[PDB]
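assembly run, all chains below
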Amino acid sequence: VPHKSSLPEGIRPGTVLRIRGLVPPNASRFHVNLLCGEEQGSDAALHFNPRLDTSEVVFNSKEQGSWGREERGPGVPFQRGQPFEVLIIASDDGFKAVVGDAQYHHFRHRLPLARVRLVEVGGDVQLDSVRIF
Amino acid sequence: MSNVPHKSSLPEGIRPGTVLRIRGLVPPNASRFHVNLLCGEEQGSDAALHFNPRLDTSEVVFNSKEQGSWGREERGPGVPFQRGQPFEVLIIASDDGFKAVVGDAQYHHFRHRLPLARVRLVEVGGDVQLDSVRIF
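ok done. output:
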């Protein structure tokens, strides 16, 4: 079952999302989604998708039911059997993804930051905590 | 010789979305310590933010300094620092001010008095053992 953090006021430049958890021993992939509503199939301002089985981290957006063009970060800073800490930092121009205290990828906004209403974490991850500062 | 404040430069300044992470330890007999967001490298430069945990009065004072004059102090609730204990502080810049997070809890919101665009260095001084300043 996915974890959901409701943000009915939305988020602004200066919003910090900290996601901690464990990648379990046989994990295929997991995701952190910044969604614009609570309906299934809602728009995704950010889809952050570490894929352990393919050794890729995919970034994408979803807009009226259709996915955009994927972006990929450099390699995969996640491992089966290892805990992680991800920061997703909203600024005026995009999201900064920090993994293991290292700046990892910058994802330019494709949807207005103001439309975000929900953070959802799902897939093969054993969640420690999601915090929004 | 000891107690020289630690400085970290901000070569391109800071913006909404800048995250300052300050990790340290409060010495067993600390009086007070501070984190300053300063607008220049000279003594007496303006402080966009002065974050001043005071253990001997059990309070946390927030303020700004402009033209060598301190502004109106604000205080957070109580004091989430303890002598002899490690701490982690987040200072997060937004459009409307700085959010101070202490011990993983939102602690105070200090609305901007000086422009974020003028902040050019982080200074940590007082009775504190500084482990790391990281800028995200």
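The interface with chain A takes residues 15-17, 19, 90, 92-95, 99, 101, 104, 106, 134, 136 of chain B (CB under 8 Å).

The radius of gyration of chain B is 14 Å.

not gonna interpret more than that til we talk
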